[PDB]
Design a protein around this motif. Structure first.
Motif, mmCIF file in Angstrom:
data_model
loop_
_atom_site.group_PDB
_atom_site.id
_atom_site.type_symbol
_atom_site.label_atom_id
_atom_site.label_comp_id
_atom_site.label_asym_id
_atom_site.label_seq_id
_atom_site.Cartn_x
_atom_site.Cartn_y
_atom_site.Cartn_z
ATOM 1 N N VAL A 1 0.832 -1.198 0.000
ATOM 2 C CA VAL A 1 0.000 0.000 0.000
ATOM 3 C C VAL A 1 0.864 1.244 0.000
ATOM 4 O O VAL A 1 1.613 1.464 0.946
ATOM 5 N N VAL A 2 0.778 2.053 -1.059
ATOM 6 C CA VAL A 2 1.630 3.260 -1.118
ATOM 7 C C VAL A 2 0.952 4.452 -0.406
ATOM 8 O O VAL A 2 -0.188 4.821 -0.719
ATOM 9 N N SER A 3 1.644 4.993 0.597
ATOM 10 C CA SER A 3 1.127 6.092 1.381
ATOM 11 C C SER A 3 2.203 7.147 1.532
ATOM 12 O O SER A 3 3.173 7.161 0.763
ATOM 13 N N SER A 4 2.011 8.051 2.487
ATOM 14 C CA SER A 4 2.690 9.332 2.469
ATOM 15 C C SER A 4 3.011 9.823 3.871
ATOM 16 O O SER A 4 2.422 9.370 4.869
ATOM 17 N N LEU A 5 3.938 10.776 3.937
ATOM 18 C CA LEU A 5 4.189 11.454 5.200
ATOM 19 C C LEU A 5 2.873 12.085 5.627
ATOM 20 O O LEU A 5 2.505 12.008 6.785
ATOM 21 N N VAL B 1 -3.336 19.754 2.076
ATOM 22 C CA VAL B 1 -3.516 18.389 1.544
ATOM 23 C C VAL B 1 -4.581 17.607 2.353
ATOM 24 O O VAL B 1 -4.466 16.394 2.520
ATOM 25 N N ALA B 2 -5.616 18.310 2.825
ATOM 26 C CA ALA B 2 -6.534 17.756 3.840
ATOM 27 C C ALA B 2 -7.315 16.510 3.384
ATOM 28 O O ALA B 2 -7.388 15.533 4.121
ATOM 29 N N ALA B 3 -7.914 16.567 2.195
ATOM 30 C CA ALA B 3 -8.640 15.415 1.625
ATOM 31 C C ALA B 3 -7.710 14.220 1.309
ATOM 32 O O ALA B 3 -8.063 13.073 1.577
ATOM 33 N N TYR B 4 -6.535 14.503 0.741
ATOM 34 C CA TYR B 4 -5.537 13.481 0.446
ATOM 35 C C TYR B 4 -5.099 12.774 1.727
ATOM 36 O O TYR B 4 -5.035 11.546 1.777
ATOM 37 N N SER B 5 -4.857 13.568 2.771
ATOM 38 C CA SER B 5 -4.386 13.075 4.062
ATOM 39 C C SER B 5 -5.463 12.259 4.788
ATOM 40 O O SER B 5 -5.180 11.243 5.439
ATOM 41 N N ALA B 6 -6.715 12.677 4.676
ATOM 42 C CA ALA B 6 -7.806 11.855 5.231
ATOM 43 C C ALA B 6 -7.812 10.458 4.603
ATOM 44 O O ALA B 6 -7.993 9.485 5.296
ATOM 45 N N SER B 7 -7.603 10.377 3.285
ATOM 46 C CA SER B 7 -7.622 9.103 2.551
ATOM 47 C C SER B 7 -6.413 8.191 2.852
ATOM 48 O O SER B 7 -6.540 6.960 2.953
ATOM 49 N N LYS B 8 -5.244 8.815 3.032
ATOM 50 C CA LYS B 8 -4.003 8.128 3.408
ATOM 51 C C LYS B 8 -4.009 7.687 4.885
ATOM 52 O O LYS B 8 -3.542 6.608 5.193
ATOM 53 N N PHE B 9 -4.546 8.497 5.793
ATOM 54 C CA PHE B 9 -4.813 8.022 7.153
ATOM 55 C C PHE B 9 -5.740 6.849 7.197
ATOM 56 O O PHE B 9 -5.515 5.880 7.919
ATOM 57 N N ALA B 10 -6.846 6.943 6.475
ATOM 58 C CA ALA B 10 -7.814 5.844 6.405
ATOM 59 C C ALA B 10 -7.160 4.530 5.970
ATOM 60 O O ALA B 10 -7.473 3.495 6.522
ATOM 61 N N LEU B 11 -6.256 4.581 4.987
ATOM 62 C CA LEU B 11 -5.469 3.395 4.538
ATOM 63 C C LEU B 11 -4.687 2.781 5.682
ATOM 64 O O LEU B 11 -4.698 1.585 5.871
ATOM 65 N N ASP B 12 -3.972 3.616 6.435
ATOM 66 C CA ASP B 12 -3.230 3.111 7.592
ATOM 67 C C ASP B 12 -4.163 2.378 8.557
ATOM 68 O O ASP B 12 -3.938 1.228 8.861
ATOM 69 N N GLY B 13 -5.244 3.013 8.985
ATOM 70 C CA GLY B 13 -6.175 2.347 9.928
ATOM 71 C C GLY B 13 -6.863 1.124 9.384
ATOM 72 O O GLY B 13 -7.059 0.133 10.111
ATOM 73 N N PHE B 14 -7.265 1.156 8.111
ATOM 74 C CA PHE B 14 -7.870 -0.038 7.546
ATOM 75 C C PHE B 14 -6.859 -1.180 7.332
ATOM 76 O O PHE B 14 -7.099 -2.317 7.796
#
Ligand SMILES: NC(=O)c1ccc[n+]([C@@H]2O[C@H](COP(=O)([O-])OP(=O)(O)OC[C@H]3O[C@@H](n4cnc5c(N)ncnc54)[C@H](OP(=O)(O)O)[C@@H]3O)[C@@H](O)[C@H]2O)c1
Ligand SMILES: NC(=O)c1ccc[n+]([C@@H]2O[C@H](COP(=O)([O-])OP(=O)(O)OC[C@H]3O[C@@H](n4cnc5c(N)ncnc54)[C@H](OP(=O)(O)O)[C@@H]3O)[C@@H](O)[C@H]2O)c1
Ligand SMILES: NC(=O)c1ccc[n+]([C@@H]2O[C@H](COP(=O)([O-])OP(=O)(O)OC[C@H]3O[C@@H](n4cnc5c(N)ncnc54)[C@H](OP(=O)(O)O)[C@@H]3O)[C@@H](O)[C@H]2O)c1
Ligand SMILES: NC(=O)c1ccc[n+]([C@@H]2O[C@H](COP(=O)([O-])OP(=O)(O)OC[C@H]3O[C@@H](n4cnc5c(N)ncnc54)[C@H](OP(=O)(O)O)[C@@H]3O)[C@@H](O)[C@H]2O)c1
Ligand SMILES: C[C@H](NC1=NC(=O)[C@@](C)(C(F)(F)F)S1)c1ccccc1F
Ligand SMILES: C[C@H](NC1=NC(=O)[C@@](C)(C(F)(F)F)S1)c1ccccc1F
Ligand SMILES: C[C@H](NC1=NC(=O)[C@@](C)(C(F)(F)F)S1)c1ccccc1F
Ligand SMILES: C[C@H](NC1=NC(=O)[C@@](C)(C(F)(F)F)S1)c1ccccc1F
Lengths: 263, 262, 254, 254
Positions: free
Chosen positions: C144-148, C157-170
């Protein structure tokens, strides 16, 4: 590569405070693995017993030299005598401590000073005396320390000062050694409550928590030493041993490892 | 700690000892304290430099300013210095322990004399000064400030003896703070953890070896005093003010909290 | 319990999403050179053919593309079914695509938030669900490719960061579910700093190399690591780790 | 420092206020003499009346499902009309969830994301003009599962993690753009709520904190404009949740 009892076979080892407690237990493990050991402590009577048993255990050789580590001449001379008797040295286990009780620090400066001399200064003296023999064998130094040499605890202020000083001194020279390319490892052991006679008599009154077995402790110290590990952690609580690691210290040390330029 | 902002008036009329106050951070603390109208007693070995510090203190606005010169290698001086200092001011509110033995960067080889001198000057004498001052500090519900270093929280090569002595300060005074909590002693203990500060001594000893941003000694000094007056447990000061966020240890706070019920 | 060598990907069946450009394109090239089977996807049909031809050139065991938008969940599910058919199975699923995004203050852009969540997060779950039978067949891996910006807060980058956080938790939660249930599918989360892709360089700061980034993602996936970190600064990468989170997960495990 | 004075006369929305922590929040706000508008999908009428018995400046309800983003945007305009403004927006509602290993339940992942996260963004967008006028507060209720990985709650965890990414990012947008609206993320451990106790009994072996104090600590945190608010049975735990390495990295505030 994992730990194997054959690592100590015919290794020349010194163990200090080896007449009782974890020190005695370490002498016996080493004895079973067939190492050469020289044990020391103040009391010749109890040392004589540690030695006979070490022989019965199958130690390649066992001997004692008695004296007090309040005396830095004895400390320095003992290492020479030990090393010459064995024909070298592969591991120095620094374990002894001055007698201490739980009490609120009052005015007892003489005890702060005695703690610093026996628990800290003697260890530096013993290391200096041993380094040449250890450089020759690419050997290792094992320093036995405590949870109170990592965090603050009431009732043990002189004793915590001296164990914190061990971490400070020896962790700094470990960095010094890795750049000077001295092939001598330095292992710091951080121990929680261990079921040794004196610990149990000292603490069992005031606090109480579960004391780990001295025999497993002793063995875990030797293995960290054998495997050239930087730190060994040992407590009855797995929580405690997870919590005792300091990742942020590790971060700062790498961060600052670049900002000096030495030769 | 005190849930309030620092104001200089906190130190007006306060009676303060500053050790190693002939140069570097120690001298700047005396000046800051003088500007705030505190009574000050400063110490170090150099009689002549101490006199100059005293003069500037007096014209800066000190309620009173004195010096007593001696070596903290001598535990009899340390013990007597504090008695004499408390006679000069009529009591004591803050004790700032700042002096250290002349030390320079070097690989450890066999200088046990140096390891010993470090432990005596940079650690033992602080214990001796603290024993002497505790009665006076208890009467005023005052504060002990202990100045320390990065190398007293992390390992650093070339400062092995010094680092030993600064680690021992954390261990000793952090344990006494616990003891003061059990036995209801109203004397705060602030341990200051400093990165590189641009003092004469530091700048010469590390030139060409360490390559770091040295922070200003004037601001450093003030932060130490503020820390002390607000009765903080720890004070962190470094040019790289984000580094100071690492040096705090929550696992340590947890194990201290956890074992507080044993 | 090992170290990386390219030969670990030789003959492996690998899906790469967002593979028409940037990091994903580099990953496909690396995999081709390693001699993997590769099925690439993105919207750009004509670019994907070019990626496919160059993957063959480089030595891929085989290479195919399927074009479509990951805003369409039916495409996401069908894509994985067809990728498996073209390869004869699946060893590794590299989830890399993101929706078009700019640095912008958040005002009232709900549509961007929802679309970010759809493309950047929910399509990853749909692709995982579709790929799982096959990855179970193979004891495979999810990358899974994610980000700082999926570990810490960054303005703009609020919407992008919500989606990348969600990846970590899921993906971190199901990762613990796979332990306990003994499902031998590894899950690698790659946390990346600024990388010198055409898209990021325009939208934005020291940029790390894309080619070297791509290999490091593959390596972590190949070594079955939980998290992979990659920034132009070694300091940043030391700090991205979270020991405290490890303790608490270690704790609550009982 | 905090005093119940602070909320006397303040205009507050509480979502998911018909049970558990949400309901208790309305009551505390009622005993403090605040204007409350409470929402949920009847029991709200019971809640609105009990709010009057406890002496709220006013107490109203508007029933609906936060699955409907049109409802969400309309409910806030309505609620803002009824009180003539807004001081605190408390976002607390979640979609109904169970403990379960994730298998192929994409619909639940999607529902969770819509109700638990996307709706909170819809409510905030609609609330932003009013909260700007009154220099107000947004209070987002989250969880242990929104900070650390936790098996069995993958969907939930994704949505909670997404709240952290989104709101902490805008928090930092508000600062650099000097918008004087505060954001409070509440991280809750297990609470002895009627849904949570039924959901986790026999499965999570954990000490439950009480409904009453949780609500108040939530309120205090938001009254006090705190960035995050931790609350769990365990005194222990809460020292580990703070992440300095996150703080440090965000300080590429540059
Ligand atoms: N036991 C625990 O709960 C525990 C916990 C944390 C750390 N540790 C560490 O583990 C190590 C061993 O402790 P332990 O409980 O096993 O100790 P112990 O049973 O009291 O043994 C201490 C040893 O050191 C010797 N010793 C005392 N004064 C000495 C002196 N002046 N010169 C030379 N030797 C002296 C003692 O023998 P003589 O009196 O005959 O000289 C004895 O052999 C210590 O370093 C301690 O800090 C133990
Ligand atoms: N500067 C830094 O980069 C730095 C970094 C980390 C921590 N610190 C800490 O901050 C504090 C101040 O350091 P600094 O850089 O300001 O040092 P400094 O400028 O060298 O000052 C040391 C002071 O102690 C005195 N001193 C030396 N030997 C003494 C003795 N035997 N007895 C009594 N006083 C003696 C010196 O005066 P005399 O020689 O006249 O007696 C001088 O007043 C220290 O505790 C240090 O460990 C400093
Ligand atoms: N570059 C960075 O500084 C950086 C930093 C941190 C993290 N990352 C992560 O690394 C990954 C790759 O980033 P990148 O910089 O390489 O980005 P990129 O160059 O823009 O590539 C993104 C890929 O996604 C595809 N794509 C876009 N919208 C799509 C849609 N709706 N449906 C299906 N595919 C779509 C694009 O191709 P098409 O237009 O052909 O569809 C492209 O192939 C991302 O997950 C990103 O979050 C990158
Ligand atoms: N309780 C815990 O142990 C715990 C732990 C961690 C975090 N939290 C957090 O605390 C907050 C409240 O938790 P809780 O335990 O109090 O939950 P709860 O008791 O079940 O209350 C949930 C509320 O949300 C409402 N709701 C459900 N579906 C809705 C929908 N589709 N549209 C609008 N409203 C809806 C419910 O009312 P209706 O059914 O009548 O609509 C109910 O009022 C949540 O954000 C949760 O994540 C709680
Ligand atoms: C040798 C022992 N060391 C300890 N080291 C520690 O950290 C202590 C507090 C314990 F292990 F946690 F209990 S006890 C000790 C030191 C001082 C006084 C008694 C006593 F048993
Ligand atoms: C007083 C100073 N203390 C320091 N304490 C530290 O931690 C050092 C290494 C630094 F701040 F990190 F640079 S320097 C110092 C100590 C030892 C030798 C020189 C010298 F300048
Ligand atoms: C793909 C990229 N992701 C990033 N993720 C991050 O954490 C950023 C801020 C960076 F790497 F830190 F710079 S950039 C991105 C996200 C949003 C807008 C532009 C853009 F290039
Ligand atoms: C509302 C509750 N939220 C929780 N949040 C968490 O982090 C959990 C695991 C707990 F708090 F740790 F217990 S429970 C919950 C979420 C999902 C399913 C059941 C359930 F009770």
């Amino acid at each position: 590569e994992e730990f194997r009892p054959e690592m100590l076979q015919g290794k020349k080892v010194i163990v200090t405070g080896a007449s009782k407690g974890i020190g005695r237990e370490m002498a016996y493990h080493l004895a079973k693995m067939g190492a050469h050991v020289v044990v020391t402590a103040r009391s010749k009577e109890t040392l004589q017993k540690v030695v006979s048993h070490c022989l019965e255990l199958g130690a390649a050789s066992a001997h004692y030299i008695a004296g007090t580590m309040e005396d830095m001449t004895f400390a320095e001379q003992f290492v020479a005598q030990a090393g010459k008797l064995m024909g070298g040295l592969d591991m120095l286990i620094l374990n002894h401590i001055t007698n201490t009780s739980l009490n609120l620090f009052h005015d007892d400066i003489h005890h702060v000073r005695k703690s610093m001399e026996v628990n800290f200064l003697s260890y530096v003296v013993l290391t200096v005396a041993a380094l040449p023999m250890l450089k020759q064998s690419n050997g290792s130094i094992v320093v036995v320390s405590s949870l109170a040499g990592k965090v603050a605890y009431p009732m043990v202020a002189a004793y915590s000062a001296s164990k914190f000083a061990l971490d400070g001194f020896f962790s700094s020279i470990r960095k010094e050694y890795s750049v000077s390319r001295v092939n001598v490892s330095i292992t710091l052991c951080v121990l929680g409550l261990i079921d040794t006679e004196t610990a149990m008599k000292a603490v069992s009154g005031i606090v109480h928590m579960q004391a780990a077995p001295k025999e497993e402790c002793a063995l875990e110290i030797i293995k960290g030493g054998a495997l050239r590990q930087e730190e060994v952690y040992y407590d009855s609580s797995l929580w405690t041993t997870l919590l005792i690691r300091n990742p942020s210290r590790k971060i700062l040390e790498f961060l600052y490892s670049t900002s000096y330029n030495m030769d």
